[PDB]
From TrEMBL, chain B:
Gene3D superfamilies: putative ntp pyrophosphohydrolase like domain (1.10.3420.10). Mg(2+) binds at residues 53, 56, 85, 88. Keywords: Metal-binding. GO terms for molecular function: metal ion binding; nucleoside triphosphate diphosphatase activity. It comes from the Bacteria. The keyword tRNA processing does not apply. Mn(2+) 4 binds at residues 84, 88. Residues 117-136 are annotated as: Disordered. The keyword Transmembrane does not apply. Mn(2+) 3 binds at residues 53, 56, 85, 88. This is HAD superfamily Cof-like phosphohydrolase. Residues 123-136 have a biased composition (Basic and acidic residues). DUMP binds at residues 88, 115, 118, 128-129, 131.
Length: 147, 149
């Protein structure tokens, strides 16, 4: 069974949040766990704050472009920073719910990539292909509960 | 070189950021490899998608809270709509970074470095997180600069 020959993928961003939560002493659960209302309100506040910052940075970029400015790659840095902050609190929320963000994201990706294989309307709107199946997030969460 | 012995199945799943890049190739929108200033149309598009998903996330959180205020005990299954919208929010957040030609994992890792470092600081008596000795802020400009070269 176990011998000296007995014996690991690089961490994902969702895993980084699990590690952060350990570091801040938050003890977040391994499996999906209904939160107290205080936790939901905290998560909402964090989402609102970062969404607002992203929105403000896009607004600032659009304003400069409206003035006739070409933006540089460096001009993108505040927006990139706030988008990454938004990932952090979005992953943060899933991690505090005990829900494996990568498992859920894979399911959403599956349905989105599948939809991308459909044709487009003449106006450019994406249509679904025949046999398309919606993201089954309820099924994902049920699977995560048993292991 | 690869040979007839090569294992084609890679040892590790693609990252969420890499998935977005694949998604954008699928929709006929193959996006740049390096940070690329966008036209205003693209920024307007990304903003609308962030507003839509963030409004859906908020609605699912409100709905859970309403149920709790009524005295209901939520189950794990009740979390699925919120999980779904949180994942859609990641999708359009990564989506924006990929459309900008900016490697999301590189930016995220720098933000993570600063946040994890802050987590190693002491707590003020009221529970507020303080920074440790030696703390250095996330340097996202340095990250974007590096990605251009
Ligand atoms: Gd921020
Ligand atoms: Gd959505």
């Amino acid at each position: 069974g176990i011998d000296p020959f007995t014996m690991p993928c690089p961490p994902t961003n969702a895993e980084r949040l699990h590690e952060f939560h350990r570091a801040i002493g938050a003890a977040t659960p391994e499996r999906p766990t209904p939160p107290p209302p205080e936790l939901l309100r905290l998560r909402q506040t964090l989402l609102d704050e970062e969404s607002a910052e992203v929105r403000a940075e896009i607004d600032h970029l659009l304003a400069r472009q409206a003035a006739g400015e070409a933006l540089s790659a460096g001009d993108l840095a505040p927006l990139a920073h706030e988008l990454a902050d938004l990932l952090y609190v979005t992953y943060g929320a899933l991690d505090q719910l005990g829900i494996d963000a990568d498992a859920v994201f894979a399911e959403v990706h599956r349905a989105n990539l599948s939809k991308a294989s459909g044709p487009r309307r003449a106006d450019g709107k994406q249509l679904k292909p025949e046999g398309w199946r919606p993201a089954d997030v309820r099924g994902v969460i049920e699977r995560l509960q048993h292991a």
